[PDB]
Design a binder for this molecule. Structure first.
Ligand code: CL
Ligand code: CL
Ligand code: K
Ligand code: K
Lengths: 259, 259
């Protein structure tokens, strides 16, 4: 009488309704430590008119520049970023080269009400489960460092935990990977990942190849409002900016000036 | 190719150490509401000598029998099971045919200190994330209901949340799926889930095909102590028993009598 088939079919139809009442992105994240309720990453980053959306980055050091800010208070930085209308906050959690910490993400989560990006070098599901538990809303994935199969797997794992992902790209090969893997958010990074050189025309070159459905982020070498508006005109949604703010005494004042 | 390869190599080294200090199974199940700390599923179920290890099942109704217990108090049942030395508790969460509930799992989790099995009809990552959040320590996967690739995908997802999986088999094709998926807890179900017929010689046929290092569970039609000893002699580790306890007046005393 095929009882198992009948039970499966009923369970399938009921599962559709459960997901509408409690989506993936609320099921997993609601047990992280948001002070109130998890925020919509896509809505936070999607530009609606000409408003300046900035993912502001908590970054003490960089491989190429060394220590960027000697007096580093990641909680204070995060609060000033949100106070000054950041769309989201990127938290460096890589410890050895960037002098970040996964604990910074957990501490920042408890006192912020905008999406948080775990900025790290992710290649394994454990790191994405960490990001969920420690309070990230989306994770960085680097297309150059991952095979097509591995990237798609990690994107899928993130989605099944309720996390979005920023997929960083540097060229057309990277972009082809990101699109085929199903990335929703594409970050065009102006800085070369080996030589730290800058190609500041990369958005002109790559945006014409990005599908309509994607959020486009620009990262690196951003320190002037006029250039941000130029990138907006090319179709950029939001901007990931770190060192420019961390170089300044008042990182909140530097963020405000770019809006 | 320089700095990004260096960063990735140090991150991989650090990740090995981190996993030893906070395994997958502790990182994720910290999200759940264990009273104290998450329990080791394998050690709970592995038979060391000839001790009787029972996964006692909280089950109101079944497709073949109708309502088994009209006066159904899932929390009281679970407490009575743990009091009488159950190795673990199986919570039926399927609501339509078994009259279980996902909320029973969450309620039972707050007042129990032994592993909990989510017993349901699982075919999607969302249901396994549910099992994590709601307090399960392992999940039921039915090999007859899943393709070989899909069974491995869901088992891996459970593993990446820190959950074990009881992979239920009824024949050699089911076993071949379980082997491809890498299951280490294998349940031999005497009951045919399509027509609800019963094969009580199934352990004798299938156990020689299973490495004895796996955890072998026997399921269905288990009602007398003497047959359990026979099944232990064949190499069964632990026994999943529901209806026999639920149709008794004092399920705790019925469980104690089988030890
Ligand atoms: Cl706190
Ligand atoms: Cl409570
Ligand atoms: K605190
Ligand atoms: K309660």
């Amino acid at each position: 009488a095929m009882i198992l088939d009948k039970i499966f079919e009923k369970t399938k139809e009921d599962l559709k309704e459960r997901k509408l009442k409690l989506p993936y992105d609320m099921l997993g994240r609601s047990l992280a430590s948001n002070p109130f309720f998890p925020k919509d990453v896509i809505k936070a980053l999607k530009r609606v008119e000409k408003e300046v959306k900035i993912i502001a980055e908590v970054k003490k050091a960089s491989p190429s520049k060394g220590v960027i800010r000697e007096d580093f208070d990641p909680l204070s930085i995060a609060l000033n970023y949100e106070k000054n209308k950041a769309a989201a906050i990127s938290v460096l959690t890589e410890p050895h080269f960037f002098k970040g910490s996964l604990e910074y993400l957990s501490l920042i989560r408890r006192y912020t009400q905008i999406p948080l990006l775990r900025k790290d070098f992710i290649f394994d599901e454990y790191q994405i489960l960490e990001a969920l538990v420690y309070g990230a809303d989306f994770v960085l994935l680097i297309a150059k460092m991952l095979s097509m199969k591995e990237l798609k797997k990690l994107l899928e794992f993130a989605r099944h935990l309720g996390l979005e992902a920023l997929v960083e790209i540097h060229d057309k090969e990277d972009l082809s990977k990101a699109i085929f893997a199903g990335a929703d958010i594409i970050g065009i990074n102006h800085r070369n990942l080996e030589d730290f050189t800058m190609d500041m025309s990369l958005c002109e070159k790559l945006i014409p190849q990005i599908p309509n459905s994607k959020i486009i982020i620009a990262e690196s070498g951003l320190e002037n409002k006029e250039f941000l508006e130029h990138l907006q005109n090319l179709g950029v949604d939001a901007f990931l900016i770190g060192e420019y703010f961390m170089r300044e005494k008042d990182e909140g004042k530097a963020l405000k000036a770019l809006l």
